[model samples]
Target: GTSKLKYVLQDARFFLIKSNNHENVSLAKAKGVWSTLPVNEKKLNLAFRSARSVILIFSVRESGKFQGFARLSSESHHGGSPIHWVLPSAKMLGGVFKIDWICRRELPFTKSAHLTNPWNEHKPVKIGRDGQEIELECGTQLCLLFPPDESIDLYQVIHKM
Candidate 1:
């Protein structure tokens, strides 16, 4: 007999992409292509290759708000040349990918911890600071939200479009 398949939040990886007001314009131009500071290109690329989704957010200096969420395509690309150098020895690595949006509604900014607490114990981590040499500004960088539980239907929770 075939067993029932269950879908849960932890079944897929989630990435949070943050954009500032000025950067939002580029986001609009690219449409499908999304770029983030070259912090964890390898890790982010790997996550994208696997089952994954993306959450887009916009930051207005001090406060930020949720913009949307989407299912990311597996293909990865170099986001042209380095816009700016992060370090004298290190040039900005391109962390870019194409996303298939699931929802595009603006929601009030909620702490990531608070959002994931009900379904997971592990908190989201800034892309570059997960025991890496290079560190990125948390305010306008990408974040990786780890799903630790097999409970809760993530799609239903975030797909209010």
Candidate 2:
């Protein structure tokens, strides 16, 4: 039933990473490496309370085999933590992570919730907060909610009553 749950362009936020903090040949590359990330990487992960945070932190070898993958979130006290998911036996063939990938949006989340793995002990994951949520006009909001029920002629959503 998720036929119209498409995401629209809301807004963008960007950051300039210009650090000469590494003593390597590629100070730019080395400085970007997670030899030791900041105290709060989530602060560096994403922006916007509603945006979907998909962080893929990994390590690559001289042979081009990526090994480490720390999957973190933007919303959640779990944010700003170190590497969470690491695979020792798998080979990541492609894909890249970018700070520009993060964006601000109107929806609280852009994806469906994932089912918890029953085998593993699960911890409570707290998501982000709504500091400045953007309200939508009724038409725009209706387009988003897109209730198939034609009787939802309520105008309060648009009139801000």
Candidate 3:
């Protein structure tokens, strides 16, 4: 089973979403966008359109363990919304899409190695690093996990709710 799972995901693209606070992670899971951070719109846009499958991993701690994974919506033209203000003090700048959650449970970083290489090999979270406001905000970022390629219908193997 382990070997098959790895083979199935060989061409898959993995993405990461980091948040120091669970609330932000929950929000992203619920709403499909990290409501308070600035994202790399152009890069994410390309990711959305090209990747065969985009698996999102949520990391609530600075450490390696992850909250779980979700499948990005496959609808075409499904990408980041125009930069907008979520609040007078907060802004949204990342790609947005319907999240089809796969595993809400936790998985350690080492456990993920069979499916992909070290996390750094993938596309790092793409976000604008311009101001102190963002620097002070929660550490939430959206990034590609396995350096984009492509999918084995993870939805089928994981079992549906």
RMSD of each: 10.3, 18.9, 9.8
Q: What tens-digit string does per-residue lDDT give for candidate 2 at 1-161?
A: 22212222222221212212212213213222332223233444444243332222221222121121121222233223342223331112111222211111112212212312122232111121211111222112322332233322223221311
Which sections of candidate 3 miss by over 4 Å?
Answer: 1-10, 31-39, 74-89, 93-95, 110-161
Higher-scoring candidate on TM-score, 2 or 3: 3
Q: State residue 140's C-alpha deviation in candidate 2, in Å.
A: 28
Better of 1 and 3 by TM-score: 3
lDDT of 1 by residue, 75-121 (tens): 45764544432221223435555555534544444544233211122
Q: State candidate 2's TM-score.
A: 0.20
Best by TM-score: 3
Q: Where is model 2 poorest over a 10-residue stretch in terms of lDDT?
A: 123-132
Q: 1-161 in candidate 3: lDDT tens per residue?
A: 23433433444565556555666666665665543243444434456576555555667655566665665664323345652423323334433455665556565555444342233343223321211111101111222222222333444644421
Q: Which candidate is the best by lDDT?
A: 3
Worst 10 residues of 3 by lDDT: 131-140
lDDT of every predicted structure (CA atoms): 0.40, 0.24, 0.45
